[PDB]
Amino acid sequence: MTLQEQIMKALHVQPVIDPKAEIRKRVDFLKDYVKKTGAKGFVLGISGGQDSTLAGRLAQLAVEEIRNEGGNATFIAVRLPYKVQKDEDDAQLALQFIQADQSVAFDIASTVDAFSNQYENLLDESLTDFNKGNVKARIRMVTQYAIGGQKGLLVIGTDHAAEAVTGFFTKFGDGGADLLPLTGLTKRQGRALLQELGADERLYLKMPTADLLDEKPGQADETELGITYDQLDDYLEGKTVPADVAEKIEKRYTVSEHKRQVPASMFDDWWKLAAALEH
Amino acid sequence: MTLQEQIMKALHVQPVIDPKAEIRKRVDFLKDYVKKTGAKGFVLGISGGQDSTLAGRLAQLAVEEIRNEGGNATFIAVRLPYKVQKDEDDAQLALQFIQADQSVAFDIASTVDAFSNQYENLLDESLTDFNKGNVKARIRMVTQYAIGGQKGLLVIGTDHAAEAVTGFFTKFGDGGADLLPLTGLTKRQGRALLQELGADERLYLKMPTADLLDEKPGQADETELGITYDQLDDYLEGKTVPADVAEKIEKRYTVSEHKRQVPASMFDDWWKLAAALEH
Numbered sequence: 022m023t024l025q026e027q028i029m030k031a032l033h034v035q036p037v038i039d040p041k042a043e044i045r046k047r048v049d050f051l052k053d054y055v056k057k058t059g060a061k062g063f064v065l066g067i068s069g070g071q072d073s074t075l076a077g078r079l080a081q082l083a084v085e086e087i088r089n090e091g092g093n094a095t096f097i098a099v100r101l102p103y104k105v106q107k108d109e110d111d112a113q114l115a116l117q118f119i120q121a122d123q124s125v126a127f128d129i130a131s132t133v134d135a136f137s138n139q140y141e142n143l144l145d146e147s148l149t150d151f152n153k154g155n156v157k158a159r160i161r162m163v164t165q166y167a168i169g170g171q172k173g174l175l176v177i178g179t180d181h182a183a184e185a186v187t188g189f190f191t192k193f194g195d196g197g198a199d200l201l202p203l204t205g206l207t208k209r210q211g212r213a214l215l216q217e218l219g220a221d222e223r224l225y226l227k228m229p230t231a232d233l234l235d236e237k238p239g240q241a242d243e244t245e246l247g248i249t250y251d252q253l254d255d256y257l258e259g260k261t262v263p264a265d266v267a268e269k270i271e272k273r274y275t276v277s278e279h280k281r282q283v284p285a286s287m288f289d290d291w292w293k294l295a296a297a298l299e300h
Numbered sequence: 301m302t303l304q305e306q307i308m309k310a311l312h313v314q315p316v317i318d319p320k321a322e323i324r325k326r327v328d329f330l331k332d333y334v335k336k337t338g339a340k341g342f343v344l345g346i347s348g349g350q351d352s353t354l355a356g357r358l359a360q361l362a363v364e365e366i367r368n369e370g371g372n373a374t375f376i377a378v379r380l381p382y383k384v385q386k387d388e389d390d391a392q393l394a395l396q397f398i399q400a401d402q403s404v405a406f407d408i409a410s411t412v413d414a415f416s417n418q419y420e421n422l423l424d425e426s427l428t429d430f431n432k433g434n435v436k437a438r439i440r441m442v443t444q445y446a447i448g449g450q451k452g453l454l455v456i457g458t459d460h461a462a463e464a465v466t467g468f469f470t471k472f473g474d475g476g477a478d479l480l481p482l483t484g485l486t487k488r489q490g491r492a493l494l495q496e497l498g499a500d501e502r503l504y505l506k507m508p509t510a511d512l513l514d515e516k517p518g519q520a521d522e523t524e525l526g527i528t529y530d531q532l533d534d535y536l537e538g539k540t541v542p543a544d545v546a547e548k549i550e551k552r553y554t555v556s557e558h559k560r561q562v563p564a565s566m567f568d569d570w571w572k573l574a575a576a577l578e579h
């Protein structure tokens with residue numbers, strides 16, 4: 022059980038998939054969970070990026086099916102830009118593909134800026150571009166839980182294998198959610214579900230980006246990772262990759278275990294077994 | 301096992317404790333985790349309440365010890381009121397007991413209100429007192445994580461058994477954190493640790509409250525729960541309780557399972573096993 026193999030199991034990566042069937046199980050998952058909770062439906066932030074675009078469509082399929090089955094459900098797609106979003110066009114295009122029951126825009130700037138003006142003031146230092154970026158992510162979570170709490174909806178998270186392995190998300194930010202329909206899928210697999218669902222090619226060929234920085238907006242995930250998604254997917258799918266690559270992915274993975282676990286207490290082992298951990 | 305024995309085991313509750321030793325193990329836990337993450341210390345929000353008062357003291361004891369061991373550490377106590385806290389005086393008393401390396405006051409009103417005014421404005425509706433309250437708890441998390449990211453500090457969480465069995469905390473609010481030094485302690489026991497540390501009686505005799513609502517500020521937990529901490533502690537420590545009590549406590553436990561687990565995905569079984577979840 023090599024480390025790479027241990028990661029594949031833990032992240033529920035299926036080395037080979039039938040897109041149609043995957044879409045089936047994932048849409049089935051949203052329905053079964055929402056049914057167990059008695060929630061009125063779902064809420065998800067659509068960024069124009071591949072993952073939310075895909076999670077979004079799976080959500081609309083779920084609620085429509087819940088309706089045809091004789092139930093009451095709804096999906097609200099929510100645009101959460103900071104001021105004018107660089108790729109607003111792309112988000113709109115994703116919205117055109119999703120066909121959400123409802124769609125609404127909530128600029129988070131007033132909230133974020135209120136917080137950072139307050140921080141700099143009272144703490145006599147300004148938030149670095151990075152930390153400020155994490156504020157944006159977290160405020161996006163607050164917004165989705167606000168709408169969800171008011172309308173009785175579950176918050177869909179877009180975490181998948183490609184982001185989980187490198188722990189590429191903000192703790193309690195986009196990482197905080199109730200339901201994860203993309204769990205286990207590699208980046209290229211996610212694209213394969215979009216193709217099967219007939220998504221405009223522009224929607225899955227777009228450059229993955231968290232777009233949080235004020236000075237490097239739209240920054241390529243890969244540019245921050247130092248690892249391309251071809252590699253990550255290769256690794257996750259069980260293929261072989263340059264020892265150079267494997268090792269980097271494996272260290273990023275082990276140092277981010279805290280992001281894939283609930284808060285550590287003295288009764289947990291994962292942090293004890295761990296060589297190190299970086300926050 | 302009886303459902304009760306399952307909760308006690310799952311929540312790591314010890315029916316009998318030696319206050320002196322519990323303090324040693326818990327301070328030892330803060331030191332180990334932090335030492336394994338290269339973090340520069342901790343950061344915690346001090347409410348004036350019993351939990352943050354205890355966890356706070358354990359954190360100051362940990363950083364002093366780390367420094368004494370030749371290391372480098374710091375503890376920041378952060379007051380996080382909404383406008384003006386009704387019990388600010390109690391927080392001042394707690395701060396005088398904690399004797400934290402540093403302390404700051406960060407009013408979350410401006411940030412929270414910026415959000416509310418934006419919600420009402422864009423969703424032609426207004427946040428209920430309950431949901432706004434959750435926004436505050438969640439903004440409190442944003443603030444701690446901001447300070448933690450700027451100064452390289454870990455975020456201490458004050459969750460414990462008495463609060464976990466009922467899932468009495470905000471998901472991704474105070475529930476969001478990196479380290480849980482009070483895990484497994486009952487409310488009763490937490491006061492014993494405070495007495496052992498020699499806290500002013502007023503610090504552990506105070507009325508437990510999340511104080512999140514505008515219309516009913518300083519609301520007693522017990523009033524919202526319908527279960528006194530005296531009952532919750534009996535249940536958790538293994539003692540006997542009226543059937544209707546145990547029953548109410550066990551239902552709140554199973555329905556809030558989702559708050560004690562990472563976001564659910566189709567590969568998780570806890571939600572499948574559950575008769576019903578409640579968000």
Ligand SMILES: Nc1ncnc2c1ncn2[C@@H]1O[C@H](COP(=O)(O)O)[C@@H](O)[C@H]1O
Pocket residue numbers: 065066067068070072073074099100101102103106161179190195229230231232
């Ligand atoms: N500008 C945005 N508008 C709406 N949702 C967003 C935005 N940015 C991020 N999100 C949410 O955050 C998730 C993760 O983003 P990312 O860091 O690019 O992987 C997305 O899948 C969305 O649900």
Ligand SMILES: Nc1ncnc2c1ncn2[C@@H]1O[C@H](COP(=O)(O)O)[C@@H](O)[C@H]1O
Pocket residue numbers: 344345346347348349351352378379380381382385440458468469474508509510511
């Ligand atoms: N007014 C406040 N100021 C600072 N920290 C707070 C405040 N309210 C809540 N917290 C944090 O949230 C935790 C949970 O509070 P509670 O809901 O009363 O159990 C506390 O133990 C603190 O760490």
Ligand SMILES: [Mg+2]
Pocket residue numbers: 070072073179184
């Ligand atoms: Mg993504």
Ligand SMILES: [Mg+2]
Pocket residue numbers: 068070229230231232
């Ligand atoms: Mg993105």
Ligand SMILES: [Mg+2]
Pocket residue numbers: 349351352458463
């Ligand atoms: Mg508390």
Ligand SMILES: [Mg+2]
Pocket residue numbers: 347349350508509510511
């Ligand atoms: Mg309190």
